[PDB]
Design a binder for this molecule. Structure first.
Ligand code: CLA
Ligand code: CLA
Ligand code: CLA
Ligand code: CLA
Ligand code: CLA
Ligand code: CLA
Ligand code: CLA
Ligand code: CLA
Ligand SMILES: CC1=C(/C=C/C(C)=C/C=C/C(C)=C\C=C\C=C(C)\C=C\C=C(C)\C=C\C2=C(C)CCCC2(C)C)C(C)(C)CCC1
Ligand SMILES: CC1=C(/C=C/C(C)=C/C=CC(/C)=C/C=C/C=C(C)/C=C/C=C(C)/C=C/C2=C(C)CCCC2(C)C)C(C)(C)CCC1
Ligand SMILES: CC1=C(C/C=C(\C)CCC[C@H](C)CCC[C@H](C)CCCC(C)C)C(=O)c2ccccc2C1=O
Ligand SMILES: [Ca+2]
Ligand SMILES: [Ca+2]
Lengths: 138, 31, 75, 27, 80, 731, 74, 155, 74
């Protein structure tokens, strides 16, 4: 979204996204600030975030999330959005995906990957042998 | 005796067979 | 080193990286040694002898034991 | 071991190889 | 394609979500603890298996278990 | 599916180079395949076994063909002591003039066979190269037959059902009667018809075996009842192997010691031995129940064994189903038994040389002993690894309640603690005594070292017949009932062989033997400790109670809970592999040094240098390494140059193993990322693009690669050392 | 400074420094004397100069000579 | 075979060899001077040591061999030192166990384990001189062995 | 490897004795020229040949070194 959004003043570096990002997934982070702070790029270096709107591209989701973590910790910036761009050009909203931080309980979220009882009740591997079932599956 | 058999087989099994097998194996794993 | 091991084991000593076989002489280091050997008379006017006898000049013996002699460099 | 004997052994080895290639392809 | 599974012993402390570096976990309403929240893993496709969540879990035995299964580009953490 | 794995969609979808590595590693793990069933698994294993038997037969046939076509068997039979056997011709384009001359054995460039196949084939009755060639042809035909059978049984019409694969009663009754019994009876027949006549100068072949009878009296005595006629006239004790001078007609004698000329067990005694063994096997092959309504049921026997007091719990109730439905428990048991048998084979072969003139060939003796012992170590370690795999994958405590196996898992902590105590006690005390002797000897006071005489072992030697210690108990005392009973049967010859003092039968032992035997004990206990701990703690532990849920081989559980590196049972096996290499290295070190001192006629060197480790490093590793490291030098080269180059190569592969055993994944991952950047950022080389994304070796893959490097280096280094030392010392 | 003081004291009390000065080439430097307790007295090599001890390869004797030390009082 | 060292020629040969080795170095020094007295004491000790070891048994190598079969004639060789070792280490183990049992009764046993309580530690160390008797009565009372301990899955 | 080169080169081309009239005899006469070019030479002429002094040091004043040679290995 808003691919024409201004980018932080960075001088290059050799740790940015490679050709693989061109033909595959490429993450982007767009955040807004009020002061031209200096932040350590996740790829190695120092950049100045333009006062107003900042948009940068990365090759991994973890890199964008780490940058967001430092923007939220080193600075009191919580309006950071992480999107994913595919070679076709369709953008995908990844972080926070709902406008609320993941560790902040919010309504409308459906529990995924839940197992009844504690792990001590998991079946033995011998009981699910030669079948498409796992121990954690009840 | 066939003193020529070793001279014809050692190079084949040491150079021909390995290269050919590696080529076919590379094609198989990649495709 | 590995190539020399393989050559010596195969009896092909003529194909080694040694003085007799293929030679790899430190020409630059040997040249610096020669320059040091000649320094006491052309670049060190007030120096009466080479800084170290390991570069050249002559050997020194003390108590029937060698103190410092030129350390020739080879392959 | 005459040369002809060695050739016979080689032919038998080739037959064994063919059988072992068929057995492996079937597996 | 690692499988992250949350068990009923979860106390809803959110430490797993806070320690996850790939936004793979989140907090959802629940009624199994006073916190009224439970950990969820709806984005396991982005998980790499670092197990930071397992280390950040306070329950006696980890209420969140990460099983290393299918390996993909995301799970291998390849920037190239 | 359509990618390299073809058996695991999880690996086929991997876009990195890890897919090929894991596919190669998990190729034989049939149970872990996606579309796998018990019936299909058993059928695939059956075909694999056929294809493996064919590979074994092809290997032996190759050995025979090479010995007959390029060896000097015909020239070795005439003078087995003057000449040396030849393995195969050497055709290397890199050999120089000096190398060719050094490796020339007189007519062609070949290798000196150190496998002892010449003595074995000469003892069984082979005397011509054409015979070896015919044997190779027969084995090739046998291999082809097994290949055809393997392909036939994998067909839908000839696929054996699961019930047939689990018919333990019949498989046991047919293996003990035919595979073990009839096979031994046939070998006895061969010895009586070919080996014995060939050794007595009468070559009997297919053309005349139906014409000439093995015994002058024929089969009449066997049918009448007086079998003594077959042991009436043994060799005159001065018979020359391969000739008829002082020959006898006895085909089934029970002499005691070895043939004086060949210093090997009498062929007649071997035939009589195999006859008794075959009879016992054929008799024991009728124990289980088949379709004839007579025999036993393994399940009934197992369930009937339960102490009334309840000390063992519910006895072996449920053991039968647990073993029958689990291939890993079966494989673990088979590997354990095969390891004990292959180590017993080495121990019995060195002390009682069965093959003629094998005693004189010191190089072959040492090579074979070390060979079988190293394979035995690998086999027992594999048996323990499969047992751990059985606990994780093929063991359900629900069906094994209060069972002996379940009870083992119940008090696993006690077993591990006691094994740890035994290993610690042995290590502390054995190393303390070795270093104490080393320190006192270093200070110039050898008389102050603690030398404990192996009284218990010496007593067992005396009970067997040894008289050097003067215990005079049992067979050592002529008045003993046991000695008097066998005085007229096998005791005279056996006592002559045990008291020879020159052969390896019941070698004289001293304090050094006591100390090294204790070291052997330390190693055996520590290896079994690591393996038993791996098998028992394979399902769970206080650190990781859900270990069974992660399989048998997984990297770890992360740095949480203080750290979980090497938590998996596979790592216990990988840690026990190092100890097995160490234990077997000590065993082979001791055998080789004791035998080197005996052969050279200077046992005092061992008796006085084995008490301290300085001697073990100076008089054994340093002293005997001179001929090995002198294979090639600036002055020239020797025939042992290959062994010296192999010794250095083994040292290099061992250090390369250290590489993966020290550096772990993470430094290499970043390094590979840097390399990836370099390759895709350099002109004229960007066109070439990797199909699989480069990635560092996995954690477990690194441990396996490093363990393989370390193992290859250990084995190759000691192989080169032993062969070169035993060769140069006595050649 | 304590380590240096120890080296100097060992040279003054348990070393053949004067003897070494008299015959630097024949006498082997040594400044350590092992106590006779468990047969370790053998470590006292015949370095010369009357005393027998462990030969020191630290160059303490040569350094002291270059510094002008001639007597153990210094 | 084993014979007393006093009747074995190898033992005397070794003694003479050691004396010769010491005398060779002793000759270089002077009668009354530093050293030379140091080697004479060593020679005397060698003589005493060999006279002491003459009672032991040794084979052809002349090295004293120790019989551990349990024969009363060789009790001093292994039986007596074995019993004395067991007594010393049983004392060590029993005093340690008692100190641990006392520390577990304090408010913060960890602090006691780090900073040992010299008074109570010495109180339990001085006692225990009859540890074989104290081991019993603790076992009979049931205060030695435990009943339930920490066990992981699959007991 | 650096200290190994210094030790071997010094003992084969620098350190040694000189007989009257100037004759020079090194500890290891010119063996480094043709033995230091192969790993086998580095293992035979340097690690094996020169180790004889540390393994045979038992029974003398250098026995301690030999002991330390073993301990270090452990
Ligand atoms: C354990 C049994 C045993 C073994 C291992 C041997 C081994 C050997 N024998 Mg001997 N033999 C035996 C029993 C045995 N024999 C008995 C019981 C007799 C008395 C009848 C003989 C009589 C005999 C004579 C007279 C001679 C030998 C010879 C030999 C040697 C060479 C054989 C050869 O020429 O190539 C043949 C290699 C083969 C593998 C033969 C094939 C045998 C298999 C079992 C037949 C299978 C056929 C087919 C595949 C069946 C498929 C059906 C399917 C449905 C299962 C060889 C070392 C010869 C020799 O060289 O002297 C030293 C010699 O002249 N044997
Ligand atoms: C495992 C058995 C075995 C082994 C280890 C060897 C090894 C060797 N052979 Mg030999 N060979 C064998 C069986 C074997 N052979 C048999 C049964 C025959 C009778 C036909 C021959 C006939 C033969 C001839 C005529 C010659 C050799 C030669 C050689 C040497 C050079 C290799 C070569 O170019 O020849 C190629 C060999 C073949 C094409 C035969 C292949 C058959 C084997 C059994 C296939 C291996 C299958 C094995 C059991 C499992 C492999 C598993 C692996 C993939 C993981 C080499 C040392 C040459 C030589 O002497 O050079 C000095 C030579 O002239 N061999
Ligand atoms: C495993 C089997 C094997 C075999 C049969 C050979 C055979 C050979 N090697 Mg080799 N080598 C091998 C493995 C092998 N090597 C491995 C695994 C390594 C890595 C450790 C090496 C490393 C190695 C090196 C470093 C060198 C050799 C060299 C040689 C040649 C030396 C012969 C000579 O002294 O005169 C010399 C004979 C010639 C110079 C004539 C050249 C003959 C060419 C190479 C063969 C014809 C090719 C043909 C034109 C192409 C196919 C036909 C085309 C019309 C389509 C020889 C032909 C030496 C060499 O000469 O390299 C060329 C050499 O430098 N090898
Ligand atoms: C008399 C009938 C008979 C016979 C002879 C065999 C024989 C065999 N069966 Mg089989 N089986 C049978 C009936 C029989 N079976 C029946 C009725 C069933 C159904 C219940 C089965 C079901 C079955 C299965 C499912 C399998 C077999 C397998 C095998 C093979 C085992 C591997 C091997 O190496 O063998 C030979 C083994 C030995 C000779 C013993 C090992 C060595 C010991 C320790 C003795 C040591 C000897 C001596 C000291 C060595 C001397 C030195 C040497 C250098 C000469 C073997 C050839 C397996 C196989 O390989 O499939 C192809 C397998 O998977 N069988
Ligand atoms: C009859 C014996 C036997 C049989 C039938 C099996 C069968 C099996 N084993 Mg087992 N094992 C055995 C003996 C046996 N094993 C022994 C003796 C050991 C100890 C060495 C082991 C230790 C072991 C472990 C630790 C594991 C298995 C596993 C397995 C299963 C999967 C194997 C696989 O997919 O990898 C295929 C094998 C390979 C790709 C070969 C690997 C490469 C080798 C080791 C390199 C060695 C060097 C090479 C020879 C080159 C040297 C060259 C140099 C000299 C120049 C399978 C059912 C695995 C399992 O259970 O899966 C969960 C498992 O983890 N085995
Ligand atoms: C003998 C054991 C051994 C060996 C051979 C190596 C070798 C290597 N290490 Mg190393 N390492 C080791 C032990 C070893 N290590 C141990 C125990 C540790 C733990 C501390 C480490 C930790 C370590 C680190 C942290 C690093 C390395 C790195 C490297 C590489 C440096 C690049 C280079 O110069 O390539 C040269 C290759 C060699 C010297 C190997 C032998 C080359 C021979 C002479 C060529 C033979 C070729 C011939 C054709 C044979 C092939 C036949 C063909 C048929 C296959 C190199 C391959 C560094 C690296 O990644 O690269 C920059 C790196 O930083 N290692
Ligand atoms: C850089 C120096 C160096 C290095 C790193 C190595 C490394 C190695 N050497 Mg080696 N060696 C060297 C220099 C070196 N060597 C030199 C200069 C020589 C003289 C030329 C030798 C001569 C040599 C020989 C003859 C042998 C080796 C072997 C080995 C390998 C042993 C494998 C192992 O894990 O150890 C295992 C360690 C031991 C078994 C202990 C070794 C020695 C002790 C004193 C034996 C004590 C035995 C005693 C009964 C055990 C119980 C005592 C305990 C209870 C207290 C290993 C790769 C051996 C081998 O082939 O691998 C098995 C081999 O036999 N080396
Ligand atoms: C109170 C002290 C104490 C006591 C009574 C015991 C008692 C016991 N230990 Mg143990 N141990 C101790 C300390 C102690 N240990 C310490 C400090 C360590 C860490 C080094 C260990 C490590 C250890 C292991 C690895 C094992 C045992 C085992 C055992 C049992 C069998 C004997 C044995 O192998 O001992 C072995 C003793 C040692 C290895 C070293 C002992 C350390 C010192 C020398 C003694 C403790 C002194 C202590 C500080 C004194 C406190 C005095 C107090 C008044 C202040 C036995 C019940 C074995 C077992 O599991 O049971 C079958 C076993 O495998 N222990
Ligand atoms: C005489 C002798 C001998 C011996 C032998 C043997 C064999 C023994 C044994 C034994 C045994 C078989 C035992 C068992 C046991 C068990 C148990 C179970 C025990 C125990 C105990 C405990 C448990 C504890 C203790 C303690 C003490 C008392 C002290 C310290 C503290 C404590 C508490 C730790 C011989 C022959 C060598 C030689 C001669 C001499
Ligand atoms: C892991 C595991 C396992 C196991 C493992 C192993 C590895 C084992 C082994 C083992 C072994 C390795 C064994 C051995 C043995 C032996 C024995 C048991 C014996 C004996 C005895 C006797 C009976 C004797 C006798 C005699 C006689 C006859 C006379 C002379 C003298 C004598 C003494 C010799 C299983 C699978 C189960 C389960 C799962 C887990
Ligand atoms: C050297 C090293 C590497 C780097 C090693 C690499 C990248 C392997 C590269 C060499 C391979 C063996 C050759 C690959 C090229 C082949 C021709 C491809 C053939 C097909 C195969 C995939 C089967 C690690 O990744 C590593 C990881 C963890 C612990 C230790 C280490 C380690 O020591
Ligand atoms: Ca014949
Ligand atoms: Ca015939």
């Amino acid at each position: 979204l808003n691919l024409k959004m201004p980018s932080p003043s960075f001088l290059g570096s050799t740790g940015g996204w490679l050709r693989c990002a061109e033909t595959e997934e490429k993450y982007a982070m767009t955040w807004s600030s009020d002061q031209q702070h200096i932040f350590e790029m996740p790829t190695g270096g120092a950049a100045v975030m333009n006062s107003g709107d900042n948009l940068l591209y990365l090759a991994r989701k973890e890199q964008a999330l780490a940058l967001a973590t430092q923007l939220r910790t080193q600075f009191k910036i919580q309006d950071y959005k992480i999107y994913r761009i595919f070679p076709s050009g369709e953008v995908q909203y990844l972080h926070p995906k709902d406008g609320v931080l993941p560790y902040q309980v919010n309504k409308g979220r459906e529990q995924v990957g839940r197992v009844k009882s504690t792990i001590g009740k998991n079946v033995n591997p011998a009981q699910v042998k030669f079948t498409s079932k796992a121990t954690y599956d009840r | 005796s066939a003193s020529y058999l070793p001279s014809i087989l050692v190079p084949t099994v040491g150079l021909i067979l390995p290269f050919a097998s590696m080529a076919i194996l590379f094609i198989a794993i990649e495709k | 080193y590995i190539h020399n091991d393989t050559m010596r084991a195969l009896g092909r000593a003529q194909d080694m990286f040694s003085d007799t076989a293929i030679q790899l002489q430190p020409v630059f280091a040997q040249w610096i040694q020669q320059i040091h050997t000649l320094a006491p008379g052309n670049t060190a006017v007030n120096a009466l002898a080479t800084a170290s006898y390991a570069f050249g000049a002559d050997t020194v013996t003390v108590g029937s034991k060698i103190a410092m002699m030129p350390i020739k460099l080879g392959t | 071991i005459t040369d002809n004997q060695v050739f016979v052994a080689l032919i038998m080895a080739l037959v064994c190889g063919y059988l072992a290639v068929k057995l492996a392809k079937q597996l | 394609a690692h499988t992250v599974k949350i068990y009923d012993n979860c106390i809803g402390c959110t430490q797993c979500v806070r320690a996850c570096p790939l936004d793979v976990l989140e907090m959802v309403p629940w009624d199994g603890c006073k916190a009224g929240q439970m950990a969820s893993a709806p984005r396991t496709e982005d998980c790499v298996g670092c197990k930071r969540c397992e280390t950040a879990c306070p329950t006696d035995f980890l209420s969140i278990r990460v099983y290393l299964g299918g390996e993909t580009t995301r799970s291998m953490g390849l920037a190239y | 599916a359509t990618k390299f794995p073809k058996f695991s969609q999880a690996l086929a979808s991997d876009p990195t180079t890890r897919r090929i590595w894991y596919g190669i590693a998990t190729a034989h793990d049939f149970e872990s395949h996606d579309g796998m069933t018990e019936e299909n698994l058993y059928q695939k294993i059956f075909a694999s076994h056929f294809g493996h038997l064919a590979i074994i037969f092809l290997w032996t046939s190759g050995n025979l063909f090479h010995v007959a076509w390029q060896g000097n068997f015909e020239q070795w039979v005439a003078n087995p002591l003057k000449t040396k056997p030849l393995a195969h011709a050497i055709w290397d384009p890199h050999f120089g003039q000096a190398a060719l001359k050094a490796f020339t054995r007189g007519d062609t460039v070949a290798n000196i066979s150190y496998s002892g196949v010449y003595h074995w084939w000469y003892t069984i009755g082979i005397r011509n190269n054409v015979e070896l060639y015919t044997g190779a042809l027969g084995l090739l035909v046998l291999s082809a037959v097994f290949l055809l059978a393997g392909w036939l049984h994998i067909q839908p019409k000839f696929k054996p059902s699961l019930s047939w694969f689990k018919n333990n009663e019949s498989r046991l009754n047919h293996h003990l009667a035919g595979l073990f019994g009839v096979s031994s009876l046939a070998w006895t027949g061969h010895l009586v018809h070919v080996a014995i006549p060939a050794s007595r100068g009468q070559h009997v072949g297919w053309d005349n075996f139906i014409m000439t009878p093995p015994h002058p009296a024929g089969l009449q005595p066997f049918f009448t009842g007086n079998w003594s006629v077959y042991a009436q006239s043994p060799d005159s004790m001065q018979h020359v192997f391969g000739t008829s001078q002082g020959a006898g007609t006895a085909i089934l004698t029970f002499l005691g010691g070895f043939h004086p000329q060949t210093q090997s067990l009498w062929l007649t005694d071997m035939a009589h031995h195999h006859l008794a063994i075959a009879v016992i096997f054929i008799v024991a092959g009728h124990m289980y129940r088949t379709n004839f309504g007579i025999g036993h049921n393994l399940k009934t026997i197992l369930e009937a064994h339960r102490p009334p007091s309840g000390r063992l719990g519910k006895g072996h109730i449920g053991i039968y189903q647990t073993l029958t439905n689990s291939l890993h428990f079966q494989l673990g048991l088979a590997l354990a038994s095969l390891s004990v048998v292959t180590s017993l084979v080495a121990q019995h072969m060195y002390a009682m040389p069965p093959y003629a003139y094998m005693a004189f060939d010191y190089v072959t003796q040492s090579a074979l002993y070390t060979h079988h012992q190293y394979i035995a170590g690998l086999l027992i370690v594999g048996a323990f690894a499969h047992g751990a795999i059985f606990f994780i994958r093929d063991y359900d405590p629900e069906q094994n309640q209060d069972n002996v196996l379940a009870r083992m898992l119940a008090h696993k902590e006690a077993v591990i603690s006691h094994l740890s105590w035994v290993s610690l006690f042995l290590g502390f005390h054995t190393l303390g005594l070795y270093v104490h002797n080393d320190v006192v000897v270093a200070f110039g006071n050898p008389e102050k070292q603690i030398l404990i005489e192996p009284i218990f072992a010496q007593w067992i030697q005396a009970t067997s017949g040894k008289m050097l210690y003067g215990f005079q108990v049992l067979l050592s005392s002529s008045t003993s009932n046991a000695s008097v009973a066998a005085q007229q049967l096998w005791l005279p010859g056996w006592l002559e062989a045990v008291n020879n003092e020159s052969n390896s039968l019941f070698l004289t032992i001293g304090p050094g033997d006591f100390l090294v035997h204790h070291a052997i004990a330390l190693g055996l206990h520590t290896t079994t400790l690591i393996l038993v701990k791996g098998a028992l703690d394979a399902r769970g532990s206080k650190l990781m109670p859900d270990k069974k849920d992660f399989g048998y081989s997984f990297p770890c559980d992360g740095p949480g809970r203080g750290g979980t590196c090497d938590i998996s049972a596979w790592d216990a096996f990988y840690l026990a592999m190092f100890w097995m290499l160490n234990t077997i290295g000590w065993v082979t070190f001791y055998w080789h040094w004791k035998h080197l001192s005996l052969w050279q006629g200077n046992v005092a060197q061992f008796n006085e240098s084995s008490t301290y480790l300085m001697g073990w490093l100076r008089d054994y590793l340093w002293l005997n390494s001179s001929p090995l490291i002198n294979g090639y030098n600036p002055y020239g080269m020797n025939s042992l140059a290959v062994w010296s180059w192999m010794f250095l190569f083994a040292h290099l592969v061992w250090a390369t193993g250290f590489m993966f055993l020290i550096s772990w994944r993470g430094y290499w991952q970043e390094l590979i990322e840097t390399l990836a950047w370099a390759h895709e950022r350099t002109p004229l080389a960007n066109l070439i693009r990797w199909k699989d994304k480069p990635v560092a070796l996995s954690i477990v893959q690194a441990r396996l690669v490093g363990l393989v490097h370390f193992t290859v280096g250990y084995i190759l280094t000691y192989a080169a050392f032993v062969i070169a030392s035993t060769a140069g010392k006595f050649s | 400074f304590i380590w240096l003081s120890g080296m100097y004291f060992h040279g003054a009390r348990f070393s053949n420094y004067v003897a070494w000065l008299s015959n630097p080439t024949g006498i082997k430097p040594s400044a350590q004397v092992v106590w006779p307790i468990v047969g370790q007295q053998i470590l006292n090599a015949d370095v010369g100069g009357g005393m027998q001890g462990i030969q020191i390869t630290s160059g303490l004797f040569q350094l002291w000579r270059a510094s002008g030390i001639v007597n153990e009082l210094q | 075979v084993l014979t007393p060292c006093q009747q074995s020629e190898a033992f005397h040969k070794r003694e003479i060899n050691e004396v010769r080795t010491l005398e060779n170095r002793q000759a270089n020094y002077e009668a009354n001077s530093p050293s030379y007295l140091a080697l004479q004491s060593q020679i005397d000790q060698v003589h005493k040591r060999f006279d002491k070891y003459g009672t032991l048994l040794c084979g052809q190598d002349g090295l004293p061999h120790l019989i551990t079969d349990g024969d009363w004639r060789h009790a001093r060789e292994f039986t007596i030192p074995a019993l004395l070792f067991l007594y010393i280490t049983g004392w060590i183990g029993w005093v340690g166990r008692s100190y641990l049992k006392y520390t577990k009764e304090t408010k913060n046993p960890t602090e006691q384990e780090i900073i040992l309580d010299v008074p109570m530690a010495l109180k339990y160390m001085l006692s225990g001189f009859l540890w074989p008797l104290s081991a019993w009565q603790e076992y009979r009372s049931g205060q030695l062995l435990a009943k339930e301990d920490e066990i992981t899955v699959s007991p | 490897i650096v200290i190994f080169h210094f030790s071997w080169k010094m003992q084969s081309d620098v350190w040694g004795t000189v007989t009257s009239n100037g004759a020079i005899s090194h500890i290891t006469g010119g063996n480094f020229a043709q033995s230091a070019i192969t790993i086998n030479g580095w293992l035979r002429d340097f690690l094996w040949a020169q180790a004889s002094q540390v393994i045979q040091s038992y029974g003398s004043s250098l026995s301690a070194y030999g002991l330390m040679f073993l301990g270090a290995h452990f």
